[PDB]
């Protein structure tokens, strides 16, 4: 548990519906938002390839469970039926362990894909922006949307702007 | 997850025609729509797509200047306008749509409706 | 948009089919996408952004980029696998182009 989902970010946005993860930003020419597309389908290759791996490994072969045993065959029968009984506890232990220990790790991977992030742009901005906590940056200088989109996209211009946020630090 | 296509049937060359695409299971304001148009006899060939906000509508060079493209998230429904309608666009139109998991993505179609017949004949 | 107008596999075998701008390279950046149809019934995405395969999708077709071109590679061929099979290239998030179908027969 990284602590981004349900912890320093309390809560999911519902307007913001082109991705997972994104950013909403906050200028004087307006507010948006606007989803990271590459972290998003990173997600949806993970997901995927786990849902695959979980579904096209059972590696199936044809066969025919019911038999049929005469009066005089009990032992056979009950054979039978311990064959069968312990196949249905093994697969019925097995599928619900594996279903609940996925959905840890699939709740935990999104966890970890929502702090790196946060961590990426935090160490983007450095003290050019003042962390306000709830997963906000408070510029120091005024920039406009280029320079947000220069944040997302990962080209920020630290020495640019240096100046201008000493100022008003 | 699924879309319904209407409309379609026999148009004089030179009339108007409007196709309605119509989803199931998902709002429309969060996705965008895309028309995609294959003749009898050929490839599939993109027509048009407008945006999950719906602020950026981008068509194809054979549709742009005659065809329109909306959509009303409220009713879950999208529109495609012809109003130049010539014999080459007899052909199954189809809208198209790309859901993974729940979200939009822009560069996938995987979610398709059966699709409607355009006939332009005289 | 160029495709191969047919090619021919054996039940079994492996196919490679190749689709590719007529005027540029192609890139990561213009997410080929590969779509499989029958005559009777809407497309199917089969592959898109080059690798990712949506769920449900048989794991015998592959997708990358070699040299200047998008190719999709199918490995033990089945008899299900003949139909048409379309390219799609984009330029910007919404502009897409199809290529001209590649008419897979399985022997």
């Known amino acids: 548990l990284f602590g981004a989902i349900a912890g320093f970010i309390e809560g999911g946005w519902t307007g913001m519906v082109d991705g997972w993860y994104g950013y909403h930003h906050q200028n004087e020419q307006g507010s948006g938002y606007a989803a990271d597309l590459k972290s998003t389908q990173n997600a949806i290759d993970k997901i995927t390839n786990k849902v695959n791996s979980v579904i096209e490994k059972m590696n199936t072969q044809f066969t025919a469970v019911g038999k049929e045993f005469n009066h005089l065959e009990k032992r056979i029968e009950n054979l039978n039926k311990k064959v069968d009984d312990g196949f249905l506890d093994i697969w019925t232990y097995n599928a619900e362990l594996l279903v609940l220990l996925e959905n840890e790790r699939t709740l935990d991977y999104h966890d970890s894909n929502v702090k790196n992030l946060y961590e990426k742009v935090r160490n983007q901005l450095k003290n050019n922006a003042k962390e306000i906590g709830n997963g906000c940056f408070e510029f120091y200088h005024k920039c406009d949307n280029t320079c947000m989109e220069s944040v997302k996209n990962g080209t920020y211009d630290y020495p640019k702007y240096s100046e201008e946020a000493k100022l008003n630090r | 997850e699924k879309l319904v296509e209407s409309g379609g049937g026999l148009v004089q060359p030179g009339g108007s025609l409007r196709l309605s695409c119509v989803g199931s299971?998902?709002?429309?304001?969060?996705?965008?729509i895309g028309w995609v148009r294959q003749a009898p006899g050929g490839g599939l060939e993109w027509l048009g797509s407008?945006?999950?906000?719906?602020?950026?509508?981008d068509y194809a060079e054979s549709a742009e200047g005659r065809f329109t493209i909306s959509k009303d998230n409220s009713q879950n429904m999208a529109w495609l306008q012809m109003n130049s309608l010539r014999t080459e666009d007899t052909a199954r139109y189809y809208c198209?749509?790309?859901?993974?998991?729940?979200?939009?993505?822009?560069?996938?179609?995987?979610?398709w409706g059966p699709g409607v017949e355009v006939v332009v004949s005289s | 948009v160029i495709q191969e107008p047919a090619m021919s596999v054996s039940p079994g075998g492996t196919v490679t089919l190749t689709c590719a701008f007529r005027?540029?390279?192609?890139?990561?950046?213009?997410?080929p996408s590969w779509f499989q149809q029958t005559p009777g019934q809407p497309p199917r995405l089969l592959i898109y952004?080059?690798?990712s395969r949506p769920t449900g999708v048989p794991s015998r077709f592959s997708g990358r980029i070699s040299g200047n071109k998008a190719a999709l590679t199918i490995t033990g061929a089945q008899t299900e696998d003949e139909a048409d099979y379309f390219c799609?290239?984009?330029?910007?998030?919404?502009?897409?182009?199809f290529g001209g179908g590649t008419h897979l027969t399985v022997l």
């Open positions: 005027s540029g390279s192609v890139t990561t950046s213009n997410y």
């Open positions: 198209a749509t790309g859901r993974f998991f729940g979200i939009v993505v822009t560069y996938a179609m995987n979610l």
């Open positions: 299971g998902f709002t429309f304001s969060s996705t965008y």
């Open positions: 952004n080059t690798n």
């Open positions: 407008i945006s999950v906000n719906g602020d950026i509508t």
């Open positions: 799609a290239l984009y330029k910007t998030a919404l502009n897409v182009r």
